[PDB]
């Protein structure tokens, strides 16, 4: 552990809680992509299968369990509890164009041809494009509410901090994972326009 990954993890937990508490308190999931939340739940489900083969630390186990619980609870609030406010008509990204190719790529390009590693690879490639349905919904509909932009800011900052974490670990530990890195760069690049607009408009009380 280093400060960059810790801040990265804390930023990710912040985004997850901001969204869950926003839907819970308002009793509405207006402007939220249910599709992106399904993809994030699929990411945690396929990545954390090691919970049954490995113990890293109490922190690592707890964070995995918290991410799974909060992602499944967010999906529950959108598609079941507050389904009356789910804007299905505007959440129209065809997620088959993400899942089917990412699925194909994880089987073909991985560190090892074994079920657990292939599923971990799938979680890494899928996370890189998981926010696309949400950004697509915002571009279709009229802008984004301020709390929704704060969610997007902490989520985007999380994997950007993971890139800094990987520079650190490469320098001090000689550790590198090109699959996680390339996918992490893809994940961050997709937030470029949102970041520019959040800093120039949202942080200046515009949009």
């Amino acid at each position: 552990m280093n400060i960059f990954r810790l801040t990265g993890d804390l930023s990710h937990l912040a985004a997850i809680i901001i969204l869950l508490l926003k839907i819970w308190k308002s009793r509405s999931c207006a402007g939220i992509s249910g599709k992106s939340q399904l993809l994030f739940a699929l990411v945690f489900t396929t990545r954390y299968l090691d919970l049954f083969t490995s113990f890293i630390s109490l922190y690592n186990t707890s964070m995995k369990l918290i991410y799974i619980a909060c992602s499944y609870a967010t999906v529950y609030l959108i598609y079941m509890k507050f389904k009356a406010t789910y804007d299905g008509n505007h959440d129209t990204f065809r997620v088959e164009f993400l899942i089917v190719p990412v699925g194909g790529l994880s089987f073909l390009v991985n560190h090892d041809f074994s079920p657990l590693e292939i599923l971990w690879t799938f979680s890494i490639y899928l996370e890189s494009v998981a926010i696309l349905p949400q950004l697509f919904m915002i571009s279709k509909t009229g802008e984004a509410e301020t709390i929704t932009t704060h969610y997007l800011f902490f989520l985007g900052l999380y994997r950007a901090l993971y890139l800094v974490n990987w520079i650190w670990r490469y320098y001090f530990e000689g550790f590198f994972d090109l699959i996680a890195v390339v996918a992490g760069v893809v994940q961050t690049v997709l937030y470029c326009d949102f970041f520019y607009l959040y800093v120039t408009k949202v942080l200046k009380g515009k949009k």
Binding site: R5, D9, H12, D50, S54, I56, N60, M63, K64, Y67, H111, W120, Y162, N165, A180
Partner: peptide, 6 residues
Amino acid sequence: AEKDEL
């Protein structure tokens, strides 16, 4: 190689 990150 054991996965030590999230």
